[PDB]
Design a protein around this ligand. Structure first.
Ligand SMILES: [Ca+2]
Ligand SMILES: [Ca+2]
Lengths: 174, 430, 55, 144, 45, 55, 55
């Protein structure tokens, strides 16, 4: 837990090495983390359960936005993608639902991160269709997604130079 | 987390059209992910996602994003009658309104370009809702064919013809009902009007199952006459029940000889439409009685070949392909195709003579209609029985045509020379 | 000879129609940095849509 | 039959006249009939092709083809075959056709109708509503 | 390559032999229905 | 319907001048052109966001 | 030619009947040419190229 908590006060240069240590812990993409039998997987599940026992929702939210969203380095973003995917996979039902809810809570803040959010959205979508979930929260997630879509569509439609960008995209390759 | 709260990573600026479009792309990706789950798909349709995607996301973004939006809409309407009916209605409204004053507003080139690609990709998605999609396609096709404007043809009629061609001639199979010989048990005017009497279910119920003929080593001579009688008087039973008015009226295999069929077979806007129509007619020629009917249609359209010149190459290829068997050549000869083609050749040669004494207008395809009509006549004559029965009737017209072609000096084109040589060979053979 | 040159001129027609449809799509195809730079392609020309340039 | 018609029959007969393997002549003559302006159902065609087996390749003469068409002509009506129909429609001997043997005929043709449809058909045919249909009603429907 | 993105990898083709035969029969019947539809469209009024 | 949008720009301006001349001191004529323009604008506005071919 | 025609048509005092006849002839030729251009086989191609490419 302390390695993650430290990964908060480190530079984006130190972030990848801590993320790769966390990946060797969650038996994630250690090789990919570096580039960017049954008892072993049992240890992996024990470690993710220990982390979920320690990691409160606030710190979970924090690193999830810090590395999946604010990384600015696609390589660190992919490491966080693999790490969170294995965290969710190796977690039980309650922590799975809680993680899905946290990422759907971050979902409205997406417009502030632009392209960087790509990997994040991936996990969200996958998780939203992988966890058996109640109809109420399914409707809530769908409403959040369509609300963000409507907001962005209205922003693009009423954007001061939307006409200029549309016409230029039509003509000159920019 | 205190340091992260103070400052961490980087954020986009306000009114970021570029990042705003990136977030829109992320929304499209997430919705394409969610739409996979049927319950989520129904919920998103109930939200109003289809209309939002149609109005805003269909035309903006990178081409990959546009195709992803089209796939997302197809997924929402997949196996969803309420969603697919809504999408088809939106498509009709946007396309139909553009047809109005298409000459006044020629933006159609790009206006429906995306709506018709949505219809095409939807048709590609195979579902029970296929019925409403095919309905929209047929309606748009007929409306745009009623229009001769190339902009309208090349967009609407071309994608509609491609949809009909991919439906009629299915992607070749990799691993059940036979139509009535003299009747068409489907209706178009009623089906487009959403009438439950005419539908794929009702139609498929109407015709008998193909089943198994069997009797491989069984002559069943008596059974053949028996089945003849039962079939004849069961059809009589249904026909009488229908004239009393207690059953739906079937349709008679009869054509007007001036239908959208010719309108497309000959379209100078593009050969694409002509090739699609040729494929559609060739696939309509599956059944021998329907072969007879489409052959009559084509031999009636024969005049439009002379009218259109080199634009009728695809129709000519289709017509020669359909009559490659001497069986149908003899059938058409019996109907009187040989005097018709002879008169057409005579009229074309007279028109050339009339132009010969007129201005010296050079034409590159000058004689394509003449050469093609003479090739058709030679193809018919290449069958012995037709030659025997029509030598005395064709000698006069071939002599007149050859003599009138020999008069040509200034307008004599290579195609005219080939036609004259073919006429000489036919005369020597006659 | 005219027949032959006729075929060449009308042979471009379909390709021209394809280019027209592609430009009408008005897709934002960012200038592709083709490895072959033998052709004299100016920055402004590279900026001009390739479909537009192909047409 | 006016000569105008027999001449047309001979014209197409001579045009399609051809010989070879199997019974082409039979196929050629079926195409003659359809060319003449009368299109028989596939079943009618098969029946007539069989109804002519005098010589190899189903040899058909013009008089022979005239005899063939004279039997049905335009197939407008045939009370003789309508009685034979009642004979067939009524699987068990003759007298009164029933819904059971009616649906039997339907399946032999290859058509599958719900008993409800069979009941509609029999209600239409029956006139005195005795649940039975005799020539009196079979012929009535065939001439309705 | 493209396997990093879970969402893109999602699409799973799967199609069975007897269901192949049923689907091919459905395609043939739909083609026949469209043929009859167009032929009835061409019928003279 | 036809001559406003096709031809060289000088021809388009000549067509506009011709229409203006036709609608000079003619309450019926001026009303017709005005209503045509109104309808065009309305149908374009019906879906300006939906169809960006308004311009 | 057209020049002289127009000038003469507005320079000679002329009867209402022949004025209407001349106007009908002019508008009939305009309608015929407009329909020809609208339904021309490659009218779409020429319109789009005039829009995009100088020629
Ligand atoms: Ca009985
Ligand atoms: Ca009775």
């Amino acid at each position: 837990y302390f390695l993650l908590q430290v990964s908060f006060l480190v530079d984006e240069g130190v972030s990848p090495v801590l993320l790769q240590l966390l990946s060797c812990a969650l038996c994630g993409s250690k090789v990919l983390a570096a580039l960017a039998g049954s008892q072993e997987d049992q240890l992996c599940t024990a470690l993710v359960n220990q982390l979920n026992k320690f990691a409160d929702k606030e710190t979970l939210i924090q690193f999830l936005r810090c590395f999946l969203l604010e990384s600015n380095s696609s390589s660190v973003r992919w490491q966080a993608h693999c790490l969170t995917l294995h965290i969710y996979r190796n977690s039980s039902k309650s922590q799975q639902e809680l993680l899905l809810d946290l990422m759907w809570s971050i979902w409205p803040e997406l417009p502030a991160y632009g392209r960087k959010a790509a990997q994040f959205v991936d996990l969200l979508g996958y998780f939203s269709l992988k966890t058996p979930q109640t109809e109420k929260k399914l409707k809530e997630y769908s409403q959040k997604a369509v609300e963000i879509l409507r907001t962005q569509n209205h922003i693009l439609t009423n954007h001061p130079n939307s006409n200029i960008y549309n016409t230029l995209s039509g003509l000159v390759e920019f | 987390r205190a340091l992260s709260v103070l400052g961490c990573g980087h954020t986009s600026s306000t009114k970021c059209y570029g990042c705003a479009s990136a977030v829109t792309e992320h929304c499209i990706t997430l919705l394409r992910a969610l739409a996979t789950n049927p319950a989520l798909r129904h919920i998103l349709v109930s939200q109003g996602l289809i209309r939002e995607l149609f109005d805003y996301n269909l035309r903006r973004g990178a081409a990959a994003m546009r195709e992803e939006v089209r796939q997302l809409m197809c997924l929402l309407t997949r196996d969803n009658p309420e969603a697919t009916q809504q999408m088809n209605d939106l498509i009709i409204g946007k396309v139909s309104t553009a047809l109005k004053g298409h000459w006044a507003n020629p933006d159609l080139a790009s206006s429906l370009q995306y709506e018709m690609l949505l219809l095409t990709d939807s048709i590609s998605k195979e579902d029970s809702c296929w019925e409403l999609r095919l309905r929209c396609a047929l309606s748009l096709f007929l409306m745009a064919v009623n229009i001769k404007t190339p902009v309208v043809v090349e967009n609407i009629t071309l994608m509609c013809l491609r949809i009909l061609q991919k439906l009629i001639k299915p992607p070749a199979p990799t691993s059940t009902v036979k139509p009535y010989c003299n009747e068409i048990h489907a209706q178009a005017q009623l089906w487009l009007k959403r009438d439950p009497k005419a539908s794929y279910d009702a139609w498929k119920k109407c015709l008998p199952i193909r089943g198994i003929d069997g009797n491989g080593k069984a002559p069943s001579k008596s059974e053949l006459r028996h089945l003849y009688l039962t079939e004849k008087y069961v059809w009589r039973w249904k026909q009488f029940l229908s004239r009393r008015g207690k059953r739906t009226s079937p349709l008679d295999l009869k054509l007007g000889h001036n239908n959208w069929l010719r309108q497309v077979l000959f379209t100078p806007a593009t050969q694409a439409a002509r090739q699609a129509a040729c494929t559609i007619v060739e696939a309509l020629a599956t059944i021998p009685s329907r072969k007879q009917q489409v052959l009559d249609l084509l031999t009636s359209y024969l005049d439009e070949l002379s009218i259109a010149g080199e634009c009728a190459a695809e129709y000519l290829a289709l017509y020669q392909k359909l009559i490659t068997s001497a069986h149908w050549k003899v059938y058409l000869a019996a109907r009187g195709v040989l005097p018709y083609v002879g008169n057409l050749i005579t009229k074309e040669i007279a028109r050339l003579l009339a132009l010969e004494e007129a201005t010296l207008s050079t034409d590159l395809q000058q004689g394509y209609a003449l050469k093609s009509l003479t090739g058709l006549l030679s193809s018919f004559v290449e069958v012995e029985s037709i030659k025997r029965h029509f030598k005395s009737r064709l000698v006069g017209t071939v002599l007149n045509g050859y003599l009138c072609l020999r008069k040509l000096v200034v307008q004599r084109t290579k195609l005219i020379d080939e036609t004259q040589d073919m006429l000489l060979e036919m005369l020597e053979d006659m | 000879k005219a027949d032959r040159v006729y075929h060449q001129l009308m042979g471009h027609r379909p390709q021209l129609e394809n280019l027209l449809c592609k430009v009408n799509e008005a897709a934002p195809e960012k200038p592709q940095d083709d490895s072959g730079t033998a052709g004299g392609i100016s920055s402004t020309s590279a900026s001009v849509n390739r479909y537009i340039l192909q047409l | 039959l006016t000569e105008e018609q027999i001449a047309e029959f001979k014209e197409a007969f001579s045009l399609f006249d051809k010989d070879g393997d199997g019974t082409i002549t039979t196929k050629e003559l079926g195409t003659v009939m359809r060319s003449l302006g009368q299109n028989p159902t596939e079943a009618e065609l098969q029946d007539m092709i069989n109804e002519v087996d005098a010589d190899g390749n189903g040899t058909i003469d013009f008089p022979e083809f005239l005899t063939m068409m004279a039997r049905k002509m335009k197939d407008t009506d045939s009370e003789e075959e309508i009685r034979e129909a009642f004979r067939v429609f009524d699987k068990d001997g003759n007298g009164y056709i029933s819904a059971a043997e009616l649906r039997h005929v339907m399946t032999n043709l290859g058509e599958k109708l719900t008993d409800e449809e069979v009941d509609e058909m029999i209600r239409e045919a029956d006139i005195d509503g005795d649940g039975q249909v005799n020539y009196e009603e079979f012929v009535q429907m065939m001439t309705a | 390559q493209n396997s990093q993105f879970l969402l893109t990898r999602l699409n799973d083709p799967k199609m069975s032999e007897t269901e192949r035969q049923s689907m091919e029969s459905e395609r043939a019947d739909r083609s026949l229905f469209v043929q009859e539809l167009l032929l009835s469209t061409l019928v003279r009024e």
